[PDB]
Design an enzyme around this catalytic site. Structure first.
Site, PDB file in Angstrom:
ATOM      1  N   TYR A  51       0.796  -1.348   0.028  1.00 20.10           N
ATOM      2  CA  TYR A  51       0.112  -0.211   0.158  1.00 20.10           C
ATOM      3  C   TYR A  51       0.876   1.321  -0.010  1.00 20.10           C
ATOM      4  CZ  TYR A  51      -3.807  -3.464   1.769  1.00 20.10           C
ATOM      5  OH  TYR A  51      -4.625  -4.357   1.758  1.00 20.10           O
ATOM      6  N   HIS A 113       0.396 -11.973   1.944  1.00 18.45           N
ATOM      7  CA  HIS A 113      -0.673 -11.133   0.978  1.00 18.45           C
ATOM      8  C   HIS A 113      -1.508 -11.948   0.257  1.00 18.45           C
ATOM      9  CE1 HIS A 113      -1.598  -6.699   0.229  1.00 18.45           C
ATOM     10  NE2 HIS A 113      -2.562  -7.321  -0.294  1.00 18.45           N
ATOM     11  N   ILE A 273     -16.447   7.522   7.525  1.00 20.66           N
ATOM     12  CA  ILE A 273     -15.549   6.968   8.688  1.00 20.66           C
ATOM     13  C   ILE A 273     -16.524   6.820   9.961  1.00 20.66           C
ATOM     14  CG2 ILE A 273     -13.331   6.860  10.254  1.00 20.66           C
ATOM     15  CD1 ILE A 273     -12.051   8.532   7.657  1.00 20.66           C
ATOM     16  N   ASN A 276     -19.475   4.532   9.809  1.00 23.43           N
ATOM     17  CA  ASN A 276     -19.168   2.962   9.734  1.00 23.43           C
ATOM     18  C   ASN A 276     -19.112   2.380  11.072  1.00 23.43           C
ATOM     19  OD1 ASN A 276     -19.375   3.243   6.929  1.00 23.43           O
ATOM     20  ND2 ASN A 276     -17.207   2.840   6.669  1.00 23.43           N
TER      21      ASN A 276
HETATM   22  N1  LIG Z   1      -5.877  -8.752   1.446  1.00 23.95           N
HETATM   23  C1  LIG Z   1      -6.050  -8.372   0.210  1.00 23.95           C
HETATM   24  O1  LIG Z   1      -5.678  -8.675  -1.025  1.00 23.95           O
HETATM   25  C2  LIG Z   1      -6.921  -6.890   0.097  1.00 23.95           C
HETATM   26  C3  LIG Z   1      -7.449  -6.694  -1.155  1.00 23.95           C
HETATM   27  C4  LIG Z   1      -8.549  -5.726  -1.139  1.00 23.95           C
HETATM   28  C5  LIG Z   1      -8.607  -4.826   0.060  1.00 23.95           C
HETATM   29  N2  LIG Z   1      -7.990  -5.151   1.338  1.00 23.95           N
HETATM   30  C6  LIG Z   1      -8.135  -4.363   2.610  1.00 23.95           C
HETATM   31  O2  LIG Z   1      -9.621  -3.952   2.633  1.00 23.95           O
HETATM   32  C7  LIG Z   1      -9.746  -2.798   2.673  1.00 23.95           C
HETATM   33  C8  LIG Z   1     -11.379  -2.333   2.324  1.00 23.95           C
HETATM   34  O3  LIG Z   1     -11.462  -3.005   0.942  1.00 23.95           O
HETATM   35  P1  LIG Z   1     -11.605  -2.002  -0.145  1.00 23.95           P
HETATM   36  O4  LIG Z   1     -10.605  -0.919  -0.269  1.00 23.95           O
HETATM   37  O5  LIG Z   1     -11.956  -2.638  -1.616  1.00 23.95           O
HETATM   38  O6  LIG Z   1     -12.738  -0.967  -0.045  1.00 23.95           O
HETATM   39  P2  LIG Z   1     -14.315  -1.187   0.719  1.00 23.95           P
HETATM   40  O7  LIG Z   1     -14.236  -1.443   2.291  1.00 23.95           O
HETATM   41  O8  LIG Z   1     -14.976  -2.260  -0.084  1.00 23.95           O
HETATM   42  O9  LIG Z   1     -14.794   0.235   0.402  1.00 23.95           O
HETATM   43  C9  LIG Z   1     -15.179   0.576  -0.862  1.00 23.95           C
HETATM   44  C10 LIG Z   1     -15.665   2.167  -0.797  1.00 23.95           C
HETATM   45  O10 LIG Z   1     -16.916   2.126   0.144  1.00 23.95           O
HETATM   46  C11 LIG Z   1     -16.629   3.512   0.423  1.00 23.95           C
HETATM   47  N3  LIG Z   1     -17.573   3.714   1.799  1.00 23.95           N
HETATM   48  C12 LIG Z   1     -16.666   3.287   2.778  1.00 23.95           C
HETATM   49  N4  LIG Z   1     -17.797   3.571   3.806  1.00 23.95           N
HETATM   50  C13 LIG Z   1     -18.774   3.973   3.103  1.00 23.95           C
HETATM   51  C14 LIG Z   1     -20.345   4.456   3.693  1.00 23.95           C
HETATM   52  N5  LIG Z   1     -20.464   4.219   4.782  1.00 23.95           N
HETATM   53  N6  LIG Z   1     -21.182   4.628   2.643  1.00 23.95           N
HETATM   54  C15 LIG Z   1     -20.816   4.689   1.403  1.00 23.95           C
HETATM   55  N7  LIG Z   1     -19.678   4.401   0.719  1.00 23.95           N
HETATM   56  C16 LIG Z   1     -18.933   4.164   1.916  1.00 23.95           C
HETATM   57  C17 LIG Z   1     -15.504   3.900   0.353  1.00 23.95           C
HETATM   58  O11 LIG Z   1     -15.300   5.541  -0.344  1.00 23.95           O
HETATM   59  P3  LIG Z   1     -14.978   6.669   0.543  1.00 23.95           P
HETATM   60  O12 LIG Z   1     -13.489   6.567   0.988  1.00 23.95           O
HETATM   61  O13 LIG Z   1     -15.143   7.708  -0.347  1.00 23.95           O
HETATM   62  O14 LIG Z   1     -15.817   6.771   1.750  1.00 23.95           O
HETATM   63  C18 LIG Z   1     -14.608   2.765  -0.471  1.00 23.95           C
HETATM   64  O15 LIG Z   1     -13.878   3.661  -1.480  1.00 23.95           O
HETATM   65  C19 LIG Z   1      -8.856  -2.196   2.025  1.00 23.95           C
HETATM   66  O16 LIG Z   1      -8.356  -0.647   2.178  1.00 23.95           O
HETATM   67  C20 LIG Z   1      -7.425  -2.879   2.366  1.00 23.95           C
HETATM   68  O17 LIG Z   1      -7.270  -2.669   3.789  1.00 23.95           O
HETATM   69  C21 LIG Z   1      -7.126  -6.170   1.320  1.00 23.95           C
HETATM   70  C1  LIG Z   2       0.585 -11.546  -6.169  1.00 23.81           C
HETATM   71  C2  LIG Z   2      -0.380 -11.139  -7.368  1.00 23.81           C
HETATM   72  O1  LIG Z   2       0.447 -10.469  -8.248  1.00 23.81           O
HETATM   73  C3  LIG Z   2       0.418  -9.082  -8.518  1.00 23.81           C
HETATM   74  C4  LIG Z   2       1.246  -8.228  -9.099  1.00 23.81           C
HETATM   75  C5  LIG Z   2       1.099  -6.991  -9.137  1.00 23.81           C
HETATM   76  C6  LIG Z   2      -0.035  -6.379  -8.464  1.00 23.81           C
HETATM   77  C7  LIG Z   2      -0.994  -7.099  -7.952  1.00 23.81           C
HETATM   78  C8  LIG Z   2      -1.014  -8.593  -7.861  1.00 23.81           C
HETATM   79  C9  LIG Z   2      -2.357  -6.577  -7.290  1.00 23.81           C
HETATM   80  C10 LIG Z   2      -2.182  -4.972  -7.427  1.00 23.81           C
HETATM   81  C11 LIG Z   2      -3.555  -4.302  -7.366  1.00 23.81           C
HETATM   82  O2  LIG Z   2      -4.683  -4.988  -7.443  1.00 23.81           O
HETATM   83  N1  LIG Z   2      -3.631  -3.184  -6.354  1.00 23.81           N
HETATM   84  C12 LIG Z   2      -2.637  -2.383  -5.906  1.00 23.81           C
HETATM   85  C13 LIG Z   2      -4.944  -2.491  -6.225  1.00 23.81           C
HETATM   86  C14 LIG Z   2      -5.390  -2.957  -4.641  1.00 23.81           C
HETATM   87  C15 LIG Z   2      -4.630  -3.937  -4.012  1.00 23.81           C
HETATM   88  C16 LIG Z   2      -5.399  -3.826  -2.724  1.00 23.81           C
HETATM   89  C17 LIG Z   2      -5.392  -4.543  -1.522  1.00 23.81           C
HETATM   90  O3  LIG Z   2      -5.631  -4.195  -0.285  1.00 23.81           O
HETATM   91  O4  LIG Z   2      -4.566  -5.524  -1.477  1.00 23.81           O
HETATM   92  C18 LIG Z   2      -6.584  -2.804  -2.894  1.00 23.81           C
HETATM   93  C19 LIG Z   2      -7.761  -2.425  -2.024  1.00 23.81           C
HETATM   94  O5  LIG Z   2      -6.374  -2.574  -4.239  1.00 23.81           O
HETATM   95  C20 LIG Z   2      -1.648  -4.667  -8.694  1.00 23.81           C
HETATM   96  O6  LIG Z   2      -0.268  -4.829  -8.688  1.00 23.81           O
END
Ligand SMILES: NC(=O)c1ccc[n+]([C@@H]2O[C@H](COP(=O)([O-])OP(=O)(O)OC[C@H]3O[C@@H](n4cnc5c(N)ncnc54)[C@H](OP(=O)(O)O)[C@@H]3O)[C@@H](O)[C@H]2O)c1
Ligand SMILES: CCOc1ccc2c(c1)C[C@H](C(=O)N(C)Cc1cc(C(=O)O)c(C)o1)CO2
Length: 319
Positions: A51, A113, A273, A276
Site C-alpha cells: 500500500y 498477502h 468513517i 461505519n
Molecule cells: N488482502 C487483500 O488482498 C486486500 C484486497 C483488497 C482490500 N484489502 C483491505 O480491505 C480494505 C477495504 O477494501 P476496499 O479498499 O476494497 O474497499 P471497501 O471497504 O469495500 O470500500 C469501498 C468504498 O466504499 C466507500 N465507503 C466507505 N464507507 C462508506 C459508507 N458508509 N457509505 C458509502 N460508501 C462508503 C469508500 O469510499 P470513500 O473513501 O469515498 O468513503 C470506499 O472507497 C482495503 O483498504 C484494504 O485494507 C485487502
Molecule cells: C501476487 C499477485 O500478483 C500481483 C502483481 C502486481 C499487482 C497485484 C498482484 C495486485 C495490485 C492491485 O490490485 N492493487 C494495487 C489494487 C489494490 C490492492 C488492494 C489490497 O488491499 O490488497 C486494493 C484495495 O487495491 C496490482 O499490482
C-alpha cells in the site's frame, strides 16, 4: 465494540479500518484519515507493504498514542508480506522493513498477502521483456515456517494468510511439524460473493475469516471491471437500509458481523468513517440475514484475470 479471540489466544477487533488508497492519492491523506479512524473508534488498522503507506499509518498511530488518545496495546495493527518476499530468507527482513517504516516494535498481525508468488526483488510487479509479470515457485509451507519464526521472535503477535482457498489452507494446516495455525484468512467477501463455504471451513478450523471489499471495493478501472454491479446500489440492501433507517454500507457491514466474519471498511471521508462505527448500534433480523444471503452471485471485484494462469491462482477451485 467487540473482539474475537484468535486461535493463538490474542484478540482481534471485529471492525477494521482499511487503508488502501490508489497511488494518485497523496500519502498525507493516509496519515489524516487513520487519525480520524482512531478518533472515530477504530482500533483495528489494516495496512500492507503493497500500500506504500505504512510510514503514514504508523505515524498516525504514534500521534494518537502521544495524544493520550490510545495506548499501543489498544491498537491492532496488521501488515502483509508482499508476494516478491515469499522465499523464506526474505520474510523476516520484509517484516523488519515494515516495522522500521511504521516505527513500531511489532505488528499485531502479519499476513501472507497472496499465495501467488512473484519474482524476488525490490520491484513490486516484476515484468519480463514482453511485459508479463514474472511468477515465482515457492513452497508456501516454507514461507509459513519463516512466518512462525517471526511470531516466535515477537515481531508479529499473530500470523495469518490472505487470499487463500480451502486447498491452500489445508496445505498449511496439514504441514508436518506445524507450530502455529493461521489465525485468519483475509479474503474478498460481501453480499455478492459471500464465501459461505469457505466461511464454514474456516469456522470448523477456528480460523477467522476477515472480509475485504465488504462495501463492494473501490472499483478502480485498473483492477475492477466497470460493468460489474455496484454493491451499495443493490435493491435489497437499499430496502433494508430504509427499513432500519441506516445506510446500505451499514447493512453490508452488519451482515458480516452477524455471520461471524471480521469486517474491514475503507473510507477516506471523515463522515463515512464515523458512520461505519455505527454498525454496532443496530441488529439485522434472521429474515434480513436470509435476504442478504440470497444476493450471492460469485462476483469477484478482484478477479486478477491476468493472473488466472498462476499455479496458485486461488479461484481455480470451487472455493
Ligand atoms: N488482502 C487483500 O488482498 C486486500 C484486497 C483488497 C482490500 N484489502 C483491505 O480491505 C480494505 C477495504 O477494501 P476496499 O479498499 O476494497 O474497499 P471497501 O471497504 O469495500 O470500500 C469501498 C468504498 O466504499 C466507500 N465507503 C466507505 N464507507 C462508506 C459508507 N458508509 N457509505 C458509502 N460508501 C462508503 C469508500 O469510499 P470513500 O473513501 O469515498 O468513503 C470506499 O472507497 C482495503 O483498504 C484494504 O485494507 C485487502
Ligand atoms: C501476487 C499477485 O500478483 C500481483 C502483481 C502486481 C499487482 C497485484 C498482484 C495486485 C495490485 C492491485 O490490485 N492493487 C494495487 C489494487 C489494490 C490492492 C488492494 C489490497 O488491499 O490488497 C486494493 C484495495 O487495491 C496490482 O499490482
Amino acid at each position: 465494540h467487540q473482539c474475537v479471540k484468535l486461535n493463538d489466544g490474542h484478540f482481534m477487533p471485529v471492525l477494521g479500518f482499511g487503508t488502501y488508497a490508489p497511488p494518485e492519492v497523496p500519502r498525507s491523506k493516509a496519515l489524516e484519515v487513520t487519525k480520524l479512524a482512531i478518533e472515530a473508534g477504530f482500533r483495528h488498522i489494516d495496512s500492507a507493504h503493497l500500500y506504500n503507506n505504512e510510514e503514514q499509518v504508523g505515524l498516525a498511530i504514534r500521534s494518537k498514542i502521544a495524544d493520550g488518545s490510545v495506548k499501543r496495546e489498544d491498537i491492532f495493527y496488521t501488515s502483509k508480506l508482499w508476494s516478491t518476499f515469499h522465499r523464506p530468507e526474505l520474510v523476516r527482513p520484509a517484516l523488519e522493513n515494515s516495522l522500521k517504516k511504521a516505527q513500531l516494535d511489532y505488528v499485531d498481525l502479519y499476513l501472507i498477502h497472496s499465495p501467488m508468488s512473484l519474482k524476488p526483488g525490490e520491484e513490486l510487479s516484476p515484468t519480463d521483456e514482453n511485459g508479463k509479470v514474472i511468477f515465482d515457485i515457492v513452497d508456501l509451507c516454507t514461507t509459513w515456517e519463516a512466518m512462525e519464526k517471526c511470531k516466535d521472535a515477537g515481531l508479529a503477535k499473530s500470523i495469518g494468510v490472505s487470499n487463500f482457498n480451502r486447498r491452500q489452507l489445508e496445505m498449511i494446516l496439514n504441514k508436518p511439524g506445524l507450530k502455529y495455525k493461521p489465525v485468519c484468512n483475509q479474503v474478498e467477501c460481501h453480499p455478492y460473493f459471500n464465501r459461505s463455504k469457505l466461511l464454514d471451513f474456516c469456522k470448523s478450523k477456528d480460523i477467522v475469516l476477515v472480509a475485504y471489499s465488504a462495501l463492494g471495493s473501490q472499483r478502480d478501472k485498473r483492477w475492477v471491471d466497470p460493468n460489474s454491479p455496484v454493491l451499495l446500489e443493490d435493491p435489497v440492501l437499499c430496502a433494508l437500509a430504509k427499513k432500519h433507517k441506516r445506510t446500505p454500507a451499514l447493512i453490508a457491514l452488519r451482515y458480516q458481523l452477524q455471520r461471524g466474519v471480521v469486517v474491514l471498511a475503507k473510507s477516506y471521508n471523515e463522515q463515512r468513517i464515523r458512520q461505519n462505527v455505527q454498525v454496532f448500534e443496530f441488529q439485522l433480523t434472521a429474515e434480513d440475514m436470509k435476504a442478504i444471503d440470497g444476493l450471492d452471485r460469485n462476483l469477484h471485484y478482484f478477479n486478477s484475470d491476468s493472473f488466472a494462469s498462476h499455479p496458485n491462482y486461488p479461484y481455480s477451485d470451487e472455493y
